[PDB]
């Protein structure tokens, strides 16, 4: 191991913003409130040049336990859209050697 226990997970959600919004990844953990997209995981068009139509993402979750992973597409007009259908639960372990994995999803 090393010392820190941050879980950098890369998520890739295929959606489409309107040049001004964010597709959220709220998980049930403090770094991932999951129930407050405020501290979830926003995916955007970073490489993309528009706003965030395929909304990719690469954030971290420092804990090493079970965190929920509900997704909520944040928008520019109304607000979010908690896609609570395709949900998950990243049970990040406390061990080391793999404190970062993937988290794929897509809007439909």
Ligand X SMILES: OC[C@H]1O[C@H]2O[C@H]3[C@H](O)[C@@H](O)[C@@H](O[C@H]4[C@H](O)[C@@H](O)[C@@H](O[C@H]5[C@H](O)[C@@H](O)[C@@H](O[C@H]6[C@H](O)[C@@H](O)[C@@H](O[C@H]7[C@H](O)[C@@H](O)[C@@H](O[C@H]8[C@H](O)[C@@H](O)[C@H](O[C@H]1[C@H](O)[C@H]2O)O[C@@H]8CO)O[C@@H]7CO)O[C@@H]6CO)O[C@@H]5CO)O[C@@H]4CO)O[C@@H]3CO
Ligand Y SMILES: OC[C@H]1O[C@H]2O[C@H]3[C@H](O)[C@@H](O)[C@@H](O[C@H]4[C@H](O)[C@@H](O)[C@@H](O[C@H]5[C@H](O)[C@@H](O)[C@@H](O[C@H]6[C@H](O)[C@@H](O)[C@H](O[C@H]7[C@H](O)[C@@H](O)[C@@H](O[C@H]8[C@H](O)[C@@H](O)[C@@H](O[C@H]1[C@H](O)[C@H]2O)O[C@@H]8CO)O[C@@H]7CO)O[C@@H]6CO)O[C@@H]5CO)O[C@@H]4CO)O[C@@H]3CO
Chain positions contacting ligand X, by CB under 6 A:
14, 16, 19, 45, 48-50, 53-54
Interacting residues with ligand Y between 29 and 48 (CB under 6 A): 33-38
Interacting residues with ligand Y between 70 and 89 (CB under 6 A): 82
Using the rule CB under 6 A, is 22 a contact of ligand Y? no
Q: Which is nearer to ligand Y, 50 or 79 (CB)?
A: 79
What is the per-residue DSSP string for 20-79? S--EE---SSSTT-SSSGGGS--BB-SSSSSS-SS-EEEE---SSS-EE---EE--SSS-
How far apart CA 54 and CA 46 sit, in angstroms, is 10
- Which residues of the chain form contacts with ligand Y (CB under 6 A)? 28, 33-38, 82
């Amino acid at each position: 191991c090393t010392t820190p226990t941050a879980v950098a997970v890369t998520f890739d959600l295929t959606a489409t913003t309107t040049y001004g919004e964010n597709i959220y990844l709220v998980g049930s953990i403090s770094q991932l409130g999951d129930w407050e997209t405020s501290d979830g995981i926003a995916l955007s068009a970073d490489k993309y040049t528009s706003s965030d139509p395929l909304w990719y993402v690469t954030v971290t979750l420092p804990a090493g336990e079970s965190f929920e992973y509900k997704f909520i597409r944040i928008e520019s007009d109304d607000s979010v859209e908690w896609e609570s259908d395709p949900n998950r639960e990243y049970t990040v372990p406390q061990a080391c050697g793999t404190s970062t994995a993937t988290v794929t999803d897509t809007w439909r």
